[PDB]
Structures are given as C-alpha cells and as structure tokens.
Amino acid sequence: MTEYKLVVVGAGGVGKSALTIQLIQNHFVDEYDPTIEDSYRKQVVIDGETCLLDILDTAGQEEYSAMRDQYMRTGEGFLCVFAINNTKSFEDIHQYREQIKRVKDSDDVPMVLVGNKCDLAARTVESRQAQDLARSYGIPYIETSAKTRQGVEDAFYTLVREIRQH
Ligand SMILES: Nc1nc2c(ncn2[C@@H]2O[C@H](COP(=O)(O)OP(=O)(O)NP(=O)(O)O)[C@@H](O)[C@H]2O)c(=O)[nH]1
Ligand SMILES: [Ca+2]
Ligand SMILES: [Mg+2]
Ligand SMILES: [Mg+2]
Ligand code: NA
C-alpha cells in the first residue's frame, strides 16, 4: 500500500498538534503542551486507495529550528499552518516555505496552506489575504478548526491529493 509522509509545520501555538490528534485520535486537545517532534501513523482509504499516512508533528518554538532541515528532507508533503487570530503566525509562513524550497531544491513541493482556529471570532487574517498568498505559491488554502473538526480531514486529504499530482 502507498505510504504518504506528511509534515505539519508552523509557528508555536497555531494548533498543529490539535489538528493532527483530531485526525488520528478523534478528540480535541484543550491544553497546550509544546511539541518537540512526534510521529503518528494511520491507515485510511482515500478515493478508493488504501494508504498509510505517516505524519510528523513538529515544533513551532524557534528553539528547535535546528531540526527543520532534517524533516524537510524526508517529508513528501507539508501542511503549513497559521492561526486566523495571530497575524504574526501568518507572516511567519513565508519563512517555512522558503526553507522547504531550499532544502528540496524545488519550486513545486506539495503543500497546503491551513488557516486554523476558525471557530474563534478574533480574526486578524482575512480569508482573502491567505487565498492571495496560497495563489502565489500555487497551492490550496483551507480553513480549519481542530476544536469543531471543521476542515480537518479535508486539509490532510487535500494534501494527499496534491502529492498525487506530483
Ligand atoms: N479554539 C481553538 N483552539 C485551538 C485550535 N487548535 C488548537 N487550539 C488550542 O491552541 C493551543 C495550542 O494548540 P497546539 O495544537 O498545542 O499548538 P501547536 O501548534 O502544536 N504548538 P507547538 O508548536 O508549541 O507544538 C491549545 O490550547 C489548543 O487547545 C482551534 O482550532 N480552535
Ligand atoms: Ca479534550
Ligand atoms: Mg504541538
Ligand atoms: Mg488587516
Ligand atoms: Na524555516
């Protein structure tokens, strides 16, 4: 069966772990325990294909930015997450995409841009601003809430569908 190596990246506190745990374990993590580097694996059927998702949940705290080069080499597709109530986390996305491009030596790496925490009303990043950024990269933009599970499966499955176009 096909294995897909997915990597979840983004600034501290944007909901990377909450998104991944919703997908894999179907509950919402309310507390904030910062991640170093955790792996998850789930067998799923996507568009009639049985496949294994191997998901790497990475650190957003900049103290671990050294580990980025390694997981960027081995990842096949990247979920670039920001939070829609954290302007700085959106501004930080470009850093992540430039580093992925350099390490992969490619302008066409499978990626999806994810605006998380869309259940919150304190929005400072408007959907149109994120759509424009994703359009410049040539990738989809999807909004999610790990709390309500809105968009969670869609974000990860869309990334699988992007890896298949490459
Ligand atoms: N309301 C709401 N809260 C969320 C959502 N996603 C995450 N959170 C909350 O935000 C906090 C941080 O979430 P977490 O997944 O740990 O963030 P992270 O990106 O993995 N942090 P790190 O990079 O340090 O590992 C938690 O308190 C969590 O419950 C969401 O979609 N909505
Ligand atoms: Ca909980
Ligand atoms: Mg985390
Ligand atoms: Mg504004
Ligand atoms: Na980076």
Numbering used by the authors: 1 to 166
From the article:
The two conformational states have been denoted ‘R’ (assumed to be competent for GTP hydrolysis, although this has not been established definitively) and ‘T’ (assumed to be inactive in terms of GTP hydrolysis). We determined the structure of wild-type Ras•GTP and the L120A variant at room temperature, both crystallized with the same crystallographic lattice, and found that wild-type Ras•GTP is in the R state, whereas the L120A mutant is in the T state (there is evidence in the electron density for a minor population of the R state, with an occupancy of 20% or less). (B) Room-temperature crystal structure of wild-type Ras adopts the R state as defined by Mattos and colleagues, where the sidechain of Tyr 71 is buried in the hydrophobic core of the protein. Helix α3 and the C-terminal helix of Switch II shift downwards in the transition from the R state to the T state, leading to a rotation of Tyr 71 from a buried to an exposed conformation. In the crystal structure of Ras•GTP, Switch II is positioned such that the sidechain of Gln 61 is not far from the catalytically important conformation that is stabilized by the binding of the GAP.
